[PDB]
Amino acid sequence: MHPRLSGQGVFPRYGGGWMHQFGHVYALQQELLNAEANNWFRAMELWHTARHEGVAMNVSHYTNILRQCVPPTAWEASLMVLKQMRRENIRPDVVGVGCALAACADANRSEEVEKVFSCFSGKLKLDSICYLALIKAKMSRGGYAEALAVGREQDADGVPFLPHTYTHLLEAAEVADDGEMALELARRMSSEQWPVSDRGREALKKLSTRHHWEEVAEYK
Amino acid sequence: QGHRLLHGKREREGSLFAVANDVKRDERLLRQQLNALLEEERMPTPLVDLPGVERRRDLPADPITRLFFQHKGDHALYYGTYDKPSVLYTPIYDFCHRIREATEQRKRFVVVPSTIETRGCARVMHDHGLVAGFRDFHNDRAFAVELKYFQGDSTINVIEPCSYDGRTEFEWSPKMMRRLLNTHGIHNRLVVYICRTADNRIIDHIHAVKENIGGRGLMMVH
Amino acid sequence: GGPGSPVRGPGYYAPPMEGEHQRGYTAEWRDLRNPMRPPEFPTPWERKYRQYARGQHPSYDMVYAGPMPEIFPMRRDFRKPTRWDFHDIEKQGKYRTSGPY
Amino acid sequence: RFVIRQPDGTLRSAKMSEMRAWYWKEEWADFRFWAPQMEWGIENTPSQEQYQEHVPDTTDADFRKQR
Amino acid sequence: KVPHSLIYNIYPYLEEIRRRKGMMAMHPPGKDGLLMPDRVVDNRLPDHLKRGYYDDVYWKDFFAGSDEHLNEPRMGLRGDEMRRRLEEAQTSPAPTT
Amino acid sequence: HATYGAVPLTHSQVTSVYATDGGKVDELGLLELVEERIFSWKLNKWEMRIPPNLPNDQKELIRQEQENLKQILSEWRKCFGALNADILQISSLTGVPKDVVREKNRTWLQEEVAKLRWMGEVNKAALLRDAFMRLEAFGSRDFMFMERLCCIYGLARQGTFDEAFTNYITEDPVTNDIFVDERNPFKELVAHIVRNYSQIDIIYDFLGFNYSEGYRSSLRRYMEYLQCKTAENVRASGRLVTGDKGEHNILFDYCVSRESLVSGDSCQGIIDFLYINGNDVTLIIIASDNPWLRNRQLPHRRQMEGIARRVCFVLGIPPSEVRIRNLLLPPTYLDKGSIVRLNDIVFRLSNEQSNLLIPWLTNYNKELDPKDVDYTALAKTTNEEEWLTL
Amino acid sequence: FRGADTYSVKYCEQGRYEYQRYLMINRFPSEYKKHFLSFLSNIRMSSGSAT
Amino acid sequence: PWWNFQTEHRQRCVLMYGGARTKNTHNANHRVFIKKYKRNAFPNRTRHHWAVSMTGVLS
RNA sequence: UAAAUUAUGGUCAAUUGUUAGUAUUCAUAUUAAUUUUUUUAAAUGUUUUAUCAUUUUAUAAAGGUUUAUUUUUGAAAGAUUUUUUGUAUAAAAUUUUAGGAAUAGUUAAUAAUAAUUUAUAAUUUUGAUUAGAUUGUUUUGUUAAUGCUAUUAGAUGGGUGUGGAAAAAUAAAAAAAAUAAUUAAUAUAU
Ligand SMILES: [Mg+2]
Ligand SMILES: [Mg+2]
């Protein structure tokens, strides 16, 4: 029940330095940007008091709101933030878009991942995690052939491949039976020396049983 | 066993006193030739004409300047070709007087006596663009200043020591350095006032105000 | 100043000092006339006030709201017998009038 | 500490201009800077570890508990 | 010199005061020797862009390598063999002749 | 504390006073317990530890040695505090138990950092990755193990720290019984160090802890021990050790170069040890703290040729295969590379047979100090030189 | 004259007693004895109605 | 504004004596020297006083 | 006496008036006049007491002349404690003379309060003593000025050994042992 930083040598010089008339503005900015806050319901309420008190909020305030919505999987809250950032023309960073992409991917909202991916596809340099939420959205609807096109879209954009990208793309080659697609994926993991996940190991053992491609090429 | 006390800079530097009965005789040339006799060509390697430092820790921290120095054990001493010029009161006074009398005669090099506060003032004048270069700068006795000229006349117009009589020295406060930076109601980066700090670093009047220090004032030049 | 005065050295130029007086007169004594940095704190009270020990005020938009200076006729002395002025000691005495104006 | 006794005997504190009247005059005004518009997310990030570098302790100093 | 560096109080004019020194000499070197300060990625890239794509590129510097690099723990006991050898060398004679 | 009549101890009285019988003594547990007792002290516990009735030079050397022990123990205290902070930070960010952090993997680190980055916490992922990166180099329980053992052996060597580890009032954790413990874990740990580590004085002097006499006598005892296990038939008369196989295995202790180097003298070449191994000749020199004397301490090429010619005259070895090489050692300590070069050049031992003969050589992690650059330049120009053939 | 004159931010962001430097005020040993005896006499005053 | 030491000394004089200093102390007075003795017959053996001698230790 | 190393593969300047502070008029400023103003004529009531007495009431001026200064343990403050006990008597330091030479109730030691002794004593040409001028004092004035020029806080070995302290022959307050009066302005002439 106290502001965590009170004053007298903790606030920057250009703001005057502990103007006590704005002591509530200094305490409100630390609650908005608290990295240890995990209550998403308070984060939406803390935006409404910074809107009322006239507190200027940059992209770091909205990224802290979108971060807290991913463990409770608040897909409705992540879209109302991006509606407001588009309403005020505050462009979200790639970490903030990746939070709303992950909040909608874990809620099985595949139609809403694809429309928020297409909003920031050409303009923003999206991440492999931002491509991963589109992979998990395609695989949730049985689009395992279409989920491999996201991996080709990630390769065309110059975004490198991470071990969580190989984990879900090798699972997409199971239902699609795309053994020629997983031939390029398995050769790329050995050249890049990535650790193979337990879900990626069983995906390679199933396709090497059906197509017999690892035994005739001597790659294990 | 009682040992004799070494008294003076000549006995503490270990002077041979080869000339009979004279203690104030110059020794650098004979000692340089004996040190050149000391070195030998080792065959299964000799030294170069670049300057040398007696310790490996005495190398300059700049990697480009370290290419111009090498490590000689006892051959790093007695370096140089020019000797101490004669015919005043202070080495700063003589350093200002020789440059002032040689810039009027339109000469290329001025042989000035090398002290600690002289070569630092020369380095500050070379940084500000008043001096084109130097010759034999590692010599601890005297070095040559290569002057700068542009379209007939000299770059250095007025060069005056702080001890104008040659005797009375002055200690500048940082208030004096801020006065010298803002003199006659303008901002003065034109006239260069040089001082020596308590850390024996030769610093102009701009960098003295930059870190809020003063020093003993040496000379002005513009 | 000697007895009952905090001045330790002359303002601008001094005879040559040695030892701790040389380091004190040029670097380490107090100086409130420095417009960039206040006189320093001891260790370790200078590291945490690094961002505050620069400049005077960060504004540089100071709209002057006081009375305007008088250019003709210029009054040399401003001496008033006052009744409720508690700064009347500081408001008298010869002061140097040098500013932006 | 300021105090003002009213003519009816009431002891009240001083107003802001009444408190500033006892100092030297400050005759400027800032018509631009508004402190709720300060940036706080990118570069201006005051950390609690920077305030923990002073190492304020109650066992090593008991002035706070005494007050 | 430029004339505005002689009369005006702007701070990069302090760059005009000193002599010309090399940019590889003033900046700290790398693992191979002297290096330009614009050739290291962490200097030329601003800090607000070092969050999304930067670690996505540089994931391979930390989490890629051989099986002995990725599957071997490095926080184990590194002096158990010396301890066992000194214990068995103290135990086995058990006498001073 | 220091009493009237306390004396500093050598290795013999440390061996005799702390001679107790123990069975299966835990090195790491007693080490952590004694260091936990050390870290719970204040600075005022380090004040009155110098014995009073001693001359001023001996008191100054004892004060320097105790200050070195205090600063190395403070450095290990802040390192252990950083270690516990990093382990607690990893166990708090991940959610894994604390005791299984040290047995974790890099694939597990990649999975946990990818899980933290998937939830949108790049700051916590960077903190976890940096804590694990600075935990892989420092997080072993035996990290500075030989240095900590030599610190506790030095605390026993002072003689005034033995009563500072007992007579404490503690509480039982489960029953809350206030009692006074008389158990001294420092005495048990020093007894186990003396019993198991028979060459703890050699490691103590080689790490630079001995400020009184240096490491030269420990170097001579180390070379005599390594000669007795390679020649296996050794006679030792005073300062001369000889093998009687007919093949030349001779160690000659010439002089101590600290007192032999007269400051202000012109005499080129003063060595400490002379080792003749077969046809090879090694002039083992410990460098001085004077940088103006290191250039005078190494002998000339003509002097080395004269020494090799004297070896040809005395030993009757023909001058066709006679090689003489200088060897320079650091002044106040002996790093790992110097001992490796001493085993390679002088005794002709590789790494595996030196680890078989010497068990504590693998965990010896002393390196050259960075602030002595002229010694490293001189040792690079000396140790990379070819054998001088007569 | 000086109608608008501001001071540094360091003056109003500083803590208490952080400007005092450590000064070694030496004195005579007779003054040491006198001040120690005076402080020991002032400490040992009996608690009456005046103390 | 930063007041000098003379402001503090004036404050001390005001708190001591009630006022700082009475004005009109200079007065530009013509101090004339009137000699009485003969030319080289001053009644002293070393220092012969023939002008207005200033009085003051440190001023 | 190293001998002109060849994608010239990136040019597009500067100025948006925001300042790290002794700044110089050989003729102008300070002094008296063209102008000063306003008064003042002494001869005087401090008070309580136990009554021809006792208790409280410690820096007026001229003169003479000083290199320097401060703090009573004692009286009061002041207390349900008490010995006239609560460290006051000291040091460094800086004056001037248009015609520059000697000085002394003298220096140190001391079983010596209150010096019958000892000594090759002490000050001074790095300026003494005497004679002259003489309170001192970053408080004044002037200037671009570490320059020149001014000063009025004070003290007082034979008046009385009283008093804690001589400062005692005269001061619009410093209200002086019962709330004399304490609203305000003249507060003095009256
Ligand atoms: Mg009394
Ligand atoms: Mg006598």
E-contacting chains (≥3 CB pairs under 8 Å): A, B, F
D-chain residues within 8 Å CB-CB of G6? 26, 28
Test E87 with F196 for CB contact under 8 angstroms: yes
CA F18 to ligand 2 centroid distance, Å = 71
Q: Concatenated DSSP letters for chain B? A: ---PPP-SHHHHTT----STT-SSS--HHHHHHHHHHH----------SS-EESSGGGS-SSTTGGGG-EE-SSTTSS--S---------HHHHHHHHHHHHHTTT-SEEEEE--HHHHHHHHHHHHTTSEEEEESTT-SSEEEEEE-EETTEES---EEES-SSSS---EE-HHHHHHHHS-TTS--SSSEEEEE-TTS-EEEHHHHHHTT--EEEEEEE-
State both tokens at A126. Answer: 């999206």
* Chain H 1-59 residues in 7 Å CB range of strand I: 5-6, 9-10, 13, 17, 20-28, 31, 37, 39-59
* A6 assigned to a ligand binding site: yes
CA B55 to ligand 2 centroid distance, Å = 69
Test C26 with B174 for CB contact under 8 angstroms: yes
Nearest chain G residue to C96, by CA: G1
- Is residue D18 within a helix (H) or strand (E), and if so which, with residue range? helix D16-20
State both tokens at C36. Answer: 């960039």
**Mapping DSSP to helix (H, G, I), strand (E, B) and coil, where does residue D54 land?**
coil
Closest nucleotide to H20 by C1' from CA? I139
Q: Any bridge partners for residue B221, and if so which?
A: B159, B192
F51-55 long-range contacts, CB within 8 A, separation 24+: F51/F2, F51/F3, F51/F5, F51/F6, F51/F7, F51/F8, F51/F159, F51/F160, F52/F2, F52/F4, F53/F4, F53/F5
H-contacting chains (≥3 CB pairs under 8 Å): C, G
Q: Judge whether G13 is closer than 8 Å to chain A, CB to CB.
A: yes
Closest nucleotide to H9 by C1' from CA? I139
G-chain residues within 8 Å CB-CB of A9? 13-15
Is B175 near strand I, with its CB below 7 A from some atom of it?
A: yes
Test C86 with D30 for CB contact under 8 angstroms: no
Test A18 with G15 for CB contact under 8 angstroms: no
Q: Any bridge partners for residue D12, and if so which?
A: D4
State both tokens at F319. Answer: 């001058």
In whole angstroms, give the CA distance from residue D33 to residue A15. 8
Q: What are phi and psi of B6, to 5 degrees?
A: -80, 120
Is G45 near strand I, with its CB below 7 A from some atom of it?
A: no
Chain C contacts in chain H segment 19-48 (CB below 8 A): 20
Q: Any bridge partners for residue F284, and if so which?
A: F273, F327
Angle at C41 between CA C38 and CA C47, to 5 degrees: 100
In whole angstroms, give the CA distance from residue B13 to residue B30. 15
Test D27 with C65 for CB contact under 8 angstroms: yes
Contact A112, A75 (CB under 8 A): yes
State both tokens at F10. Answer: 């050598």
Test C56 with G6 for CB contact under 8 angstroms: yes
In whole angstroms, give the CA distance from residue D51 to residue D63. 18
The half-sphere exposure of D64 on its side-chain side, counting CA atoms within 13 A, is: 7
In whole angstroms, give the CA distance from residue F223 to residue F243. 13
Q: Judge whether H3 is closer than 8 Å to chain C, CB to CB.
A: yes
What are the distances in angstroms from CA A38 to CA A44, A149, F111? 12, 35, 22
Q: Concatenated DSSP letters for chain G? A: --SS----THHHH--TT-S---------HHHHHHHHHHHHHHHT---SS--
Nearest to F196 among E69, E76, E90 (CB): E90
Is C76 near strand I, with its CB below 7 A from some atom of it?
A: yes
Contact B50, B69 (CB under 8 A): yes
Contact B175, B149 (CB under 8 A): no
The resolution, in angstroms to one decimal, equals 3.1
Nearest chain D residue to G5, by CA: D26
B136: Cα separation from own chain's centroid: 10
CB atoms within 10 A of CB F264: 8
In whole angstroms, give the CA distance from residue A178 to residue A201. 16
CA G50 to ligand 1 centroid distance, Å = 14
**Protein CA at A126 to nucleotide C1' at I120, angstroms:** 106
- Nucleic acid strand I: bases within 7 A of protein CB: 14-15, 18-24, 30-32, 67-68, 78-81, 86-87, 92, 94-102, 127-142, 145-146, 149-153
Least Cα distance to B73 among B60, B57, B54, B59 occurs for: B54
In whole angstroms, give the CA distance from residue A37 to residue A27. 14
For residue D42, the distance in angstroms to the closest alpha carbon of chain G comes to 23
Closest nucleotide to G37 by C1' from CA? I87
Test A67 with F121 for CB contact under 8 angstroms: yes
Nearest to F142 among E78, E87, E89 (CB): E78
Contact F265, F332 (CB under 8 A): no
Nearest chain D residue to A15, by CA: D35
Is B182 near strand I, with its CB below 7 A from some atom of it?
A: yes
- Is residue H13 within a helix (H) or strand (E), and if so which, with residue range? helix H5-17
C-chain residues within 8 Å CB-CB of B171? 13-17, 22, 25-26
CB atoms within 10 A of CB F281: 25
C-chain residues within 8 Å CB-CB of D31? 61, 63
E-chain residues within 8 Å CB-CB of B186? 7
D-contacting chains (≥3 CB pairs under 8 Å): A, C, G
Q: What are phi and psi of F168, to 5 degrees?
A: -100, 145
Least Cα distance to F135 among F98, F190, F184 occurs for: F98
Q: Judge whether D34 is closer than 8 Å to chain C, CB to CB.
A: no
Contact A186, A218 (CB under 8 A): no
Contact F31, F149 (CB under 8 A): yes
The half-sphere exposure of G36 on its side-chain side, counting CA atoms within 13 A, is: 7
Test C51 with A13 for CB contact under 8 angstroms: yes
State both tokens at E97. Answer: 């002749």
Chain A with chain F: Cβ pairs closer than 8 A: 30
Q: Judge whether A8 is closer than 8 Å to chain D, CB to CB.
A: no
**Protein CA at H8 to nucleotide C1' at I20, angstroms:** 26
Closest nucleotide to B183 by C1' from CA? I21
C-chain residues within 8 Å CB-CB of D33? 59, 61
For residue A55, the distance in angstroms to the closest alpha carbon of chain D comes to 5
Residue by residue, what is the 3-state secondary structure of chain F?
A: CCCCCCCCCCHHHHHHHCCCCCCCCCHHHHHHHHHHHHHCCCHHHHCCCCCCCCCHHHHHHHHHHHHHHHHHHHHHHHHHHHHHHHHHHHHHHHCCCCCCCCCCCHHHHHHHHHHHHHCCCHHHHHHHHHHHHCCCCCCCCCCCHHHHHHHHHHHHHHCCCHHHHCCEEEECCCCCCEEEECCCHHHHHHHHHHHHCCCHHHHHHHCCCCCCCCCHHHHHHHHHHHHHCCCCCEEEECCEEEECCCCCEEEEECCCHHHHCCCCCCCCCCCCEEEEECCEEEEEEECCCCHHHHHHHCCCHHHHHHHHHHHHHHHCCCCCCCEEEEEEECCCCCCHHHHHHHHHHCCCCCHHHHHHHCHHHCCCCCCCCCCCHHHHHHHHHHHCCCCEEC
Contact F327, F341 (CB under 8 A): yes
* Chain C 12-71 residues in 7 Å CB range of strand I: 12-14, 33-36, 60-62
Is G15 near strand I, with its CB below 7 A from some atom of it?
A: no
B-chain residues within 8 Å CB-CB of C99? none
- Is residue C63 within a helix (H) or strand (E), and if so which, with residue range? strand C62-64
DSSP state of D39: -
CA G45 to ligand 1 centroid distance, Å = 18
Biggest CA-to-CA distance, chain B: 71
A103: Cα separation from own chain's centroid: 8
- Is residue A48 within a helix (H) or strand (E), and if so which, with residue range? helix A40-53
Contact B190, B152 (CB under 8 A): no
Which residues are within 8 A (CB) of D61 and not within 5 positions of it... i.e. 6 or more apart?
none
In whole angstroms, give the CA distance from residue F178 to residue F171. 5
CA B3 to ligand 1 centroid distance, Å = 72
